[PDB]
Amino acid sequence: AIKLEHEIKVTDQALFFDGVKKSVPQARTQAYIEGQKYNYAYGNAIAPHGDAIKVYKNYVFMTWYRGGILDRHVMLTRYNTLTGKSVTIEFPHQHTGFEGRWWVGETHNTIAVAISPKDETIHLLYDMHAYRENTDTGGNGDIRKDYFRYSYSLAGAASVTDNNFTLTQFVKDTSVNSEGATDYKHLTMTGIEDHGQFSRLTYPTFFTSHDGDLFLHMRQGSSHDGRVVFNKYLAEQGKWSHFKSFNVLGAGKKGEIKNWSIYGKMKYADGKIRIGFQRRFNLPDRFRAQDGMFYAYSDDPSGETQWKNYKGEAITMPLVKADEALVMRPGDLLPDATAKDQVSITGGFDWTVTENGDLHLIGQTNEWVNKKVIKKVYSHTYQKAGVGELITTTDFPPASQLYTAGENIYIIGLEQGRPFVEQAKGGTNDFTRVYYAPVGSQSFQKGIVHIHDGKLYYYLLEKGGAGDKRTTYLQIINLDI
């Protein structure tokens, strides 16, 4: 059976935005008020959130901002699965909120963490939402040399003893742009300052290959003109390669009918670097936001060349016309919803490929009538063993993410606050519940999932907290592969 093995408190001081939702014009224009609750522009929970948990050998690395509203420091915690002990590092940087307005919480601005399995360096990317040298902070700090925020460690830092797991392991900014003695934020990953390359970036997400190569991808640009860029860590050189575009910017002048933006995620799946995404075209049409569903994979271990669509055909690279990578048109799921903005696709998209080559993609497609969602359609698109017909069904529960281990795919979530796992054989839509925490166990408000070596690492926010400091836990659940 799937079994809970460990439950570990991470902190009682995780930052939470305990105020109310603010519009973007509100967030940009309103001044701070002392004693205010911590308002927010998007979500209210920045911890656990983003690419915030990784497992390397016997270490679980977890990031979070610390509360409350006057603190907001970037934190890195390492739990040792062999000793049961944890150690945390406080970084000088504090969450800068919405475009420098640090009293408005900004859940885009996560802290991503990765370990290089080659040289055991630690990498952190944090507090970014497409900032640039001329981002207007409204009088809240100088961002001209701080629009891209990277911290990294000495080689070997991942495995030092707890008492040595300190800021001493991390490398200061000693460039000509350095702020001084506690500046751990680097404006580049390549050793070369490059505003074209490192501005307008959002959503840091690392992934690793079988052989221990480490990669990063981010979104560059805007919701009207956006691309995914990705690079590779060069352990032998102590730096990263130049960002490479999966798709172009300015597609409207390079072969597509119009510029577009890309909503998806690259992952390492069944031994290959791949991407699944949806497109936002911003045409005045039936699509309030995103349209389509797309997927491509690379047969190149570096992920740079040999990109193909699900049929195995080479695609243009960098991609200009998303339809080369088409798998499904979610507008089809509401075939009579033809009025302006009547098909609303704003989230709920995910994908995976199992170790047997089964391709799986999920989506949420909403019907939008008089400015309200009146129908929610969940889809599951899947191809057994990478061949044959692509099956799409709407007989799928309200799940927003898919995971994989062994021959299976998994839905993992919270039901009445308690973690559950549903499992299906890859290449199928036949889920059964195989784990549900028992009555009397704790209740959680939010969790992020990391699958590693046949185990589920569930990084969880405990429900029922008050104020801007809350309690997070780590659960380690054996998937019994």
Binding-site residues for Ca(2+), in ranges, read: 173, 183, 185, 283, 285, 287
Q: How far is the CB of 180 from Ca ion (least distance, A)?
A: 9
Nearer to Ca ion (CB atom), residue 42 or residue 287: 287
Q: From CA 150, how far away is CA 186, in angstroms rounded?
A: 5
Nearer to Ca ion (CB atom), residue 7 or residue 193: 193
Query: How far does CA 254 lie from the centroid of its chain?
Result: 29
Q: From CA 380, how far away is CA 392, in angstroms rounded?
A: 6
3-state per-residue secondary structure call for the chain: CCEEEEEEEEEEEEECCCCCECCHHHHHHCCCCCCCCCEECCCCCCCCCCCCEEEECCEEEEEEEECCCCCCEEEEEEEECCCCCEEEEEEEEECCCECCECCEECCCCCEEEEECCCCCCEEEEECCEEECCCCCCCCCCCCCCCCCCEEEECCCHHHCCHHHCCHHHECCCCCCCCCCCCCCCECCCCCCCCHHHHCCEEEEEEEECCCCCEEEEEEEECCCCEEEEEEEEECCCCEECCCEECECCCHHHCCCCCCCEEEEEEEEECCEEEEEEEEECCCCCCECCEEEEEEEEECCCCCCCCEECCCCCECCCCECCHHHHEEECHHHHCCCCCCCCCEECCCCCEEEECCCCCEEEEEEEEEEECCEEEEEEEEEEEEHHHCCCCEEECCCCCCCCCEEECCEEEEEEEECCEEEEEEEECCCCCCEEEEECCCCCCCEEEEEEEEECCEEEEEEEECCCCCCEEEEEEEEEECCC
Residue 108 is a catalytic residue:
yes
Question: Which residues are known binding-site members?
Answer: 173, 183, 185, 283, 285, 287
Nearer to Ca ion (CB atom), residue 307 or residue 368: 368
* The two structure tokens encoding residue 290: 């995103």
Q: How far is the CB of 146 from Ca ion (least distance, A)?
A: 6
Q: How far is the CB of 187 from Ca ion (least distance, A)?
A: 6
Nearer to Ca ion (CB atom), residue 224 or residue 242: 224
Q: What is the dihedral of CA 274, 278, 283, 284, to 10 degrees?
A: 180
Q: How far is the CB of 452 from Ca ion (least distance, A)?
A: 20
Q: How far is the CB of 68 from Ca ion (least distance, A)?
A: 26
- Closest residue to Ca ion: CB criterion: 173
Contact (Cβ atoms closer than 8 angstroms) between residue 409 and residue 402: yes
Nearer to Ca ion (CB atom), residue 71 or residue 407: 407
Nearer to Ca ion (CB atom), residue 107 or residue 223: 223
Catalytic residue among 6, 73, 108, 452: 108
Q: How far is the CB of 291 from Ca ion (least distance, A)?
A: 7
Query: In the complex, which residues of this chain contact Ca ion (CB under 5 A)?
Result: 173, 183, 185, 283, 285, 287, 356
Q: How far is the CB of 283 from Ca ion (least distance, A)?
A: 5
Nearer to Ca ion (CB atom), residue 329 or residue 463: 329
Q: From CA 344, how far away is CA 372, in angstroms rounded?
A: 10
Residues with a known catalytic role: 108
